[PDB]
Structure formats: structure tokens, C-alpha cells
Amino acid sequence: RGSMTIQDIQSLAEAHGLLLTDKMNFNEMGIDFKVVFALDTKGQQWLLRIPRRDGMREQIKKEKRILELVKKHLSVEVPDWRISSTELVAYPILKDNPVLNLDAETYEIIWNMDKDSPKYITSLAKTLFEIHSIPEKEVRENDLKIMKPSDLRPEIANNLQLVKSEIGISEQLETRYRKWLDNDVLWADFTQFIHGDLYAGHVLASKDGAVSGVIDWSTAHIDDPAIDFAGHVTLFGEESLKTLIIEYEKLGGKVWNKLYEQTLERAAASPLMYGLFALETQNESLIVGAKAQLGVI
């Protein structure tokens, strides 16, 4: 970006009680945050998230609350936000690398783990169980979004009609979403605390596939549990999804007979959810990417 120097970053961090070496890497793929991998003067590795624009205070305080809450309930590491202002978010680096990363240029998937690892399935299922176990009372106490079963279909109906109007959508994708909305028996009669964007990019694991951490908690709220399975089906396939649901159930994960079906519809609905995102932001580059996934390109 060249928007700020290492000295500018050292000054920001020092102002929040963090003294940084001049050894820094950048990740500029984030639309909301400039990301920095930094070293403090004791050799501790830090992740800095520096907001790209003003107005993100509510977003940052909410994620802070979410991390404080999930920290009490998960066996795996989550970011420990020791700094959290409108100017800077900072946490010490966690134990393991993400399951995959994206090529800086092309956004090609680079697997850090053997995708076929069954230790990924057993450990991911345990984490899913602990996240989904987080009590509603505690969620309400933290002023987080709570979607009830009866809220889900109205909301997605409104998303469909909005995205069709503003971005456009293929006849085949629109009819799949309409059939999904009318297919009552797919929709669970309970909602649970979910990560809200749980896919391999946000899961930290050893090379053998043992999940040790989960990052990027900004989207966490009470909603359709199937949202937390959707990101698995794309990258790992339907057989792997079946193995995961079974492993989840064995732990006492609350399922229904159509969780499988709902997950596939949720995954097939990524282009609609990206439509929504790209539409709020108003970034023209993002709207064009949306059109492509929605099949109007």
C-alpha cells in the first residue's frame, strides 16, 4: 500500500503500549484491515490489524466482546486482543498456521495441511460442538445478533430480492434459492451460537490436521448451525461433510435429518451472501466479482 511506513506503525503501537522491532511482514488482502506480522522487543510475534478507514469502532468492540465470550468455552486458541482501539487491534501470534492460505496475486488455494486428514474431521467436529454449545443467555448479555428459526426465511427472501434487483442473478441460481426457501423440512426449528464464517482459511491446525485454533470472529452470532458446515462442503466435498456431521453427532452435537441438505443449500448460496457483502460496501470491483458468481457474467 505504502500508506504508512514501519516508523508510523512503531509510533501507533508504542502509543498503545507495544514496542516493535523494525522486522515486519504485510498482508494487504483484507478489505477492512491492513495486517502486519510484527516483533516486540522481547521477541514475541504479534498480529496487527490497522483499520483502512474511519467508522469501524462498533465492529471492533463487538469482535472484542465475542472473543472474551468464546475464550470461556473453547478448548482451542482464539486471538487474545490485548490492544483494541479504533486506531489499532493487536494480538500475540497463535501456535499454528491456517489450514490453507491464498496466493497474494491470483487467490489460488495453497494447502498447508493434507485435506484428506481424518484428524481434521474429528478435531473440527469437537470445535463445532463447543462453539454451538455456547449458552443463549451469555450471547444476549453481550448484545450480539440473535436470529430465531422464524427470522431465517424472511431475511434470505429479502436478500434474494435485493441482490436480484441491484446485482442480478441467473434463472438457475434464483430458482434453486426459491425452491430452498419453500422447502420447509430443511430448516431446523432451533438456532445456536455460530462462528458465522467457518472455513479452512479461519481454522489453525498442525500439518497432521489437529485443529488448535480459530481466527476471524467478527461474524459470530446465533443463527442456522448449517452456516458453520457450509464452508467445509466446497473445499472437502460431500463424503467429508457426511463424516463430519456423524463425528459432530457422536459428540452430542444437536442435528436434524436435513442438516446435510441445509448445508448444501447454504454452500450453494455463497454467491448470494457475497452479493449482499459486495452490495453494502459499494466497491465496484467487488460488485463485478459478485455478478460472476451469480452467473450474470
Residue numbers in the entry: -2 to 294
Copy text from the publication.
Module I contained two enzymes for converting lysine to glutaraldehyde, while Module II contained the last enzyme for converting glutaraldehyde to glutarate. In this study, an aldehyde dehydrogenase, ALDH, was isolated from K. pneumoniae to demonstrate its double oxidation capability. The simultaneous catalysis of the two aldehyde groups was verified through both experimental and mechanistic calculation methods, providing a enzyme that extends the existing aldehyde dehydrogenase library.
Subsequently, ALDH was crystallized to obtain the protein crystal structure with a resolution of 2.28 Å. Simultaneously, the hydrogen (H) on the central carbon of the hemiacetal is transferred from the substrate to the carbon of the amide neighbor of the cofactor NAD+; Finally, the ester bond is hydrolyzed, resulting in the formation of glutarates. Our findings indicated that the reaction could not proceed under acidic conditions; and (iv) Key residue validation: When Tyr88 residue was mutated to alanine, its catalytic efficiency was significantly reduced, nearly reaching zero. The high energy potentials of steps 2 and 5 were caused by the suboptimal orientation of IN1 and IN4 toward the cofactor NAD+. Whole-cell conversion of Mu4 produced 9.9 g/L of glutarate, which was 4.0-fold than that produced by wild-type ALDH. Finally, the above mutant sites were combined to generate the mutant Mu5 (ALDHI90C/I212C/N94S/P95N/G210T), capable of producing 13.9 g/L glutarate from 20 g/L glutaraldehyde in 30 h, representing a 5.6-fold improvement over wild-type ALDH.
